[PDB]
DNA sequence: ACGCAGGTCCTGGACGAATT
DNA sequence: TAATTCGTCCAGGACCTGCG
């Protein structure tokens, strides 16, 4: 108010070009934070930190009831509902519920019928990727 | 058998909150 | 107040496991 920059990318408004120019790193990645080790690149050095665990095994969050531990808080959420039978998402299909909601998501996609992976060597569709590799082991086992 | 699909936890982009 | 950094959500994914 008012912003005459816009980026050409997502069409988000800047008062200032140095504003759009620190912006415009998010699609180009120049000069965004870089990982010592792997020379990958991340939003913000909170990101980059976040990353950083990848390379040292780091697992800070610890579950009080059985002493595993995780990467992420979020994992460690997850992951106690599992001990507190805790199943908040259900596929409004069939009713099926679940504590993990990537699990819930992936379920969904069934009701849909997609067979999207296509075995090169056969031509049996699977659904989900992680079928279709291990299918394609039984084909490298075979020969 | 092995296709199928749920269990589990890792990774990082997205976005508002908190900090500087 | 603006910029940076943080916490968190959430989507996507990899590897595991057991059932029909
Ligand atoms: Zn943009
Ligand atoms: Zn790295
Ligand atoms: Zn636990
Ligand atoms: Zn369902
Ligand atoms: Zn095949």
Avoid at 10 to 38: A, D, I, M, N
Avoid at 51 to 71: M, N, Q, V, Y
């Amino acid at each position: 108010g008012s912003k005459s920059f816009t980026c050409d990318q997502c069409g988000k408004y800047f008062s200032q070009k140095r504003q759009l120019k620190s912006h415009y790193r998010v699609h180009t990645g120049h000069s965004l934070p870089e990982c010592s080790h792997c020379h990958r690149k991340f939003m913000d050095v909170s990101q980059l930190k976040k990353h950083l665990r990848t390379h040292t095994g780091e697992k800070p969050f610890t579950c009080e009831i059985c002493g595993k531990s995780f990467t992420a808080k979020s994992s460690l959420q997850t992951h106690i509902r599992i001990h507190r039978g805790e199943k908040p998402y259900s596929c409004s299909i069939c009713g099926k519920c679940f504590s993990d909601s990537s699990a819930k998501r992936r379920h969904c996609i069934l009701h849909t019928g997609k067979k999207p992976f296509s075995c090169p060597e056969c031509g049996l569709q699977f659904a989900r990727l992680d079928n279709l590799k291990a299918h394609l082991k039984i084909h490298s086992k075979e020969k």
